[PDB]
A paper describes a structure:
MYDGF, previously named c19orf10 (chromosome 19 open reading frame 10), is a poorly characterized protein, which was identified as a paracrine-acting protein that is secreted by monocytes and macrophages. Human MYDGF has 142 amino acids and consists of an N-terminal 31-residue-long signal peptide and the MYDGF protein sequence containing a C-terminal KDEL-like ER retention sequence. According to its primary amino acid sequence, MYDGF does not belong to any known cytokine or growth factor family. Treatment with recombinant MYDGF helps to protect and repair the heart after acute MI.
Recombinant full-length MYDGF, lacking the N-terminal signal peptide, was crystallized using sitting-drop vapor diffusion methods. MYDGF crystals diffracted to 1.6 Å. Due to the lack of initial start models, the structure of MYDGF was determined by Hg-SAD phasing by derivatization of a trigonal crystal form using Hg(II)I2. The MYDGF structure consists of 10 antiparallel β-strands forming two β-sheets, which are packed face to face to each other, forming a β-sandwich. The β-strands are connected by loops of 3–18 amino acid lengths and enclose a hydrophobic interior. A single disulfide bond between cysteine residues 32 and 61 of β-strands 3 and 5, respectively, bridges the opposing β-sheets. The asymmetric unit (ASU) contains two molecules of MYDGF forming a close contact. Analysis using PISA suggests that this dimer with a buried surface area of 1726 Å2 may be a physiologically relevant form. However, analysis of MYDGF by analytical size-exclusion chromatography clearly indicates that MYDGF is monomeric in solution. We conclude that MYDGF adopts a previously unknown β-sandwich topology.
Numbering used by the authors: 3 to 137
The structure:
Amino acid sequence: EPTTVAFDVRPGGVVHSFSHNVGPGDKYTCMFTYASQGGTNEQWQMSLGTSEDHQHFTCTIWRPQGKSYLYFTQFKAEVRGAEIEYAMAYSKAAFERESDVPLKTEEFEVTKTAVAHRPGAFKAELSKLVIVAKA
């Protein structure tokens, strides 16, 4: 029943996935799959929001305070069975004196169901993903 859940983003280079679902029959699903290098785990948050029209929903994945130290070698946020209407990925998110810093055009790709890194162009820094979708 919580709409927001905490999860650990783990270094070590092995691929991990974390997912959360809300709504009748887990209608609204969001999954974050990644692999990273680093010294410590990072507790991130995944929030799923639902709108009045029973169709639109949002998935927001982020690291509190907007800075991540992990070297991501891959990432993919997926909303299976849904259609993305808006999405943005950030290397750094706004906090105190820092501004949001969107990933550069070449770093990622937005398909109907996913926001994913672009192999060979992604710069490895990520701290926030925002997805607005229609179930």
